[PDB]
């Protein structure tokens, strides 16, 4: 029983970009070695990332996993524990963890408990494992489990019956309020009950509609937490096992974030990641003088810097002068480009055009025109100069439909869509507490393709037949044309999501049937 | 002995157990009048398909019990129908009940739970392991559910029990060519295994799916005895001949041609979405192009010209030919037709955008404004008079992003979203072939709530906690207020789907995590 160091790689994957994830894993394995780490543990499915969705069904996936193992086999002098998709001779696919040292696969674990509830759909992709993986390294017995496995009492008791010393847990555990600290409380008490250490490594970063908080930790077999990684940070954390005490050395950490601080940092991270991974030069949003847009403005500025944020105030007849001053003042305090674009002429033109159809008492229709004029103005600026539009609707509004389709719903990312109005106020107060001078004014808080016959054949091949680029070209189509079409299909996933539902007639409809990430990194070549 | 089997080609109202139960009772009584000895309903007929997360509601089992109690009053006919079977441990199965004179003779639990493509049954059900064979009038009936009949191992097990007829309940969604393919495959299976197959399928449009029906009876010699048409709700009777040991062969019309079948499916789906959402009519922009011309014909065939409105919205480069072809189809089909010029609206947008654009060169931005002016105009008319807007984008356009967000993507139902442009031409040609005078001009074919603190508490109860209205009221909230909030949440499912993605921070996000149907008939109480 020798002393050793464990590197927890709190890692943010590019979903589907196996080449990129593998390269970063190698870079992190090198960095852990420089820090005298003897093992490095990566998140669940780290080679491809989470949620990769229907990328996990592509026929060429196994060959890419094999190439990834070949590249990882070149890393020397450190045990690596990482996530991959294990496909067996029969064709079964497993959610798996590999233990590798000097190009030798020491063992493979197949996840036992496949979540298929809430945000999880793992039985669309994987068959469940039945066997356990225990390996001895430097006199220490390591067990391996994946995410949902550590929460199944039966699965963990089985591994405990093998008298494991440390359980290594790979995770893609999504964030929700309170979960980061709740994970630590539960797995600490569990570590104490079973007299074993738990090394809990979690994915970090925003991905489409999800946040992954990271917040990795090491809990000792006495129930005390030895190492605590912060939430929403990508880094390598080192834990040190003491041969004499049979415990990991306790490393002091900062206090846990307050509830609203945690939510706030999560939204900042999610906003930054969506902006960066889609390659946007910046963001733009409508500033109404109200608290939702004021909060979104602060989050955007915290995410990518004021130099990349643009704000537009779009007053109409019933827009108070106080509203304009509060919007202008926050933009000034935060250093954000600010413009004013009046809509009364646009609205009047709509009304003149609609008049012969209306003839009708005024109602929501007239107010909805105002929202749509604003949305179209923002999309004009977005189309021209490329900033992502941030929608400012909150969860209370979206719950009861107090929002306008194609009006204030306009946007490519809705920062507050899962934030109740009650929480919006709390986040605004929190953000102001971070600065000597409130950033949110305090009164705001208290108020050329081919012709269709060729094009459709290429689309049918890519969509309905789910063929890769090489196989579509082999049908007799030109290579650059096929590459361009596939690029356009993947790039417009985000746009298809906002369209209305419609009836399926094919073997592969875009909605419900075909599940692909928006932020998608799957490289075209085999 | 000879007997008659009634195949109930049945269209459920998803989630409306009361209504589905009453209609099942009506069909069973109708089948008795026609001397049927058994009546077989579709998969999950009591609740419908896809009911999605309604299948997880805690009060579901009590509603199933009431439905069984109501069905127990039907006497003198064997009923075979779909329901959600919840056992003492709380596990849920996708099940079929065999009932006669208020007695459950047997229960079958589906063995093969599809979790691919459009199916997510492992989100809701555990799999069965046992077979249900019952003898009635000397005939051995086996019972299977949908995906079960496509699993050779499952069916071979029934063959080993010497079944005479396999009864199959199905919620099999439509895709082009599938109605006839089902008959060819299951007739050969019937011949291979020397058993008859009674194949009953759900029919009707539901949200993004079409169910074609096309129920049938295949004899053990491989010949089809009875063939129901596609896209019709009806009761079909098959007669078993004691002497020949076969069902009597009943003459049917020829199978629909490929494009005739697609066309009828789109008409049916459009009608069902319109009627089940309770819209007075539909409205659409007529561009003179083939997509909107086809959508107009489908809308008229669906609900009648008196409930269809068309608007031509020309701009500077809108050809006079385009306006005439749109007007002429409207006149030919008897559709109200109006013209709304957008020149002034677009000019107002340009004037407002000018100081932001400056001397940036014109591009797609300017043309996108035209699409957005049109969409806002259509939504003005929809908001004021209540017609559903039909969007006319096709699958080729949606694949490569050759559409505009909040412009020509505007709509509440996208008739052609899964129809490639290549198929659009064939559907227009088909529709013209039905009348002496083409409907589509040939030229077109060749070109007051509570404040947010109370509101958010109620929403948290309904959403995060998934409580029924009585349990939310028991927290101390006013009954009418809770009822109104729940109504508004359910009524705005369609709207939330069209909003931008955003990051989850709660235990129940609207996107991905919470999966409810749009056309939702779940009754509020108990
Ligand atoms: N069930 C539905 N399916 C599709 N579209 C619908 C449905 N119910 C309403 N709509 C559309 O949504 C519109 C109402 O939403 P919206 O335009 O945002 O304005 P409002 O602020 O009045 O809610 C209707 O005018 C109609 O076009
Ligand atoms: N990855 C993305 N996520 C969210 N929004 C995006 C993304 N890519 C582009 N957008 C938005 O979609 C717009 C492009 O679509 P659209 O407005 O319909 O114009 P166009 O017809 O020229 O494509 C961009 O201007 C931007 O606002
Ligand atoms: Cl989790
Ligand atoms: Cl099917």
PDB file of C-alpha atoms in Angstrom, chain B residues 27 35 84 100 118 162 165 196 220 268 272 328 333 373 381 439 445 460 462 477 510:
ATOM      1  CA  UNK B  27     -67.876   0.719 -30.661  1.00  0.00           C
ATOM      2  CA  UNK B  35     -72.858  -9.931 -34.567  1.00  0.00           C
ATOM      3  CA  UNK B  84     -51.552   1.089 -18.586  1.00  0.00           C
ATOM      4  CA  UNK B 100     -66.113 -10.095 -20.975  1.00  0.00           C
ATOM      5  CA  UNK B 118     -40.134   8.179 -32.525  1.00  0.00           C
ATOM      6  CA  UNK B 162     -50.366 -23.647 -30.913  1.00  0.00           C
ATOM      7  CA  UNK B 165     -55.079 -16.384 -34.267  1.00  0.00           C
ATOM      8  CA  UNK B 196     -53.772 -16.006 -38.491  1.00  0.00           C
ATOM      9  CA  UNK B 220     -52.540 -18.693 -41.920  1.00  0.00           C
ATOM     10  CA  UNK B 268     -56.054  14.068 -42.304  1.00  0.00           C
ATOM     11  CA  UNK B 272     -57.077  16.686 -36.911  1.00  0.00           C
ATOM     12  CA  UNK B 328     -56.952  32.342 -59.585  1.00  0.00           C
ATOM     13  CA  UNK B 333     -61.204  26.796 -54.720  1.00  0.00           C
ATOM     14  CA  UNK B 373     -43.124  41.674 -42.465  1.00  0.00           C
ATOM     15  CA  UNK B 381     -54.724  38.545 -38.601  1.00  0.00           C
ATOM     16  CA  UNK B 439     -56.986  23.607 -58.648  1.00  0.00           C
ATOM     17  CA  UNK B 445     -46.012  23.402 -61.387  1.00  0.00           C
ATOM     18  CA  UNK B 460     -43.520  25.191  -8.895  1.00  0.00           C
ATOM     19  CA  UNK B 462     -47.561  22.008 -10.950  1.00  0.00           C
ATOM     20  CA  UNK B 477     -54.278  28.401  -2.812  1.00  0.00           C
ATOM     21  CA  UNK B 510     -39.775  22.724 -20.020  1.00  0.00           C
TER      22      UNK B 510
END
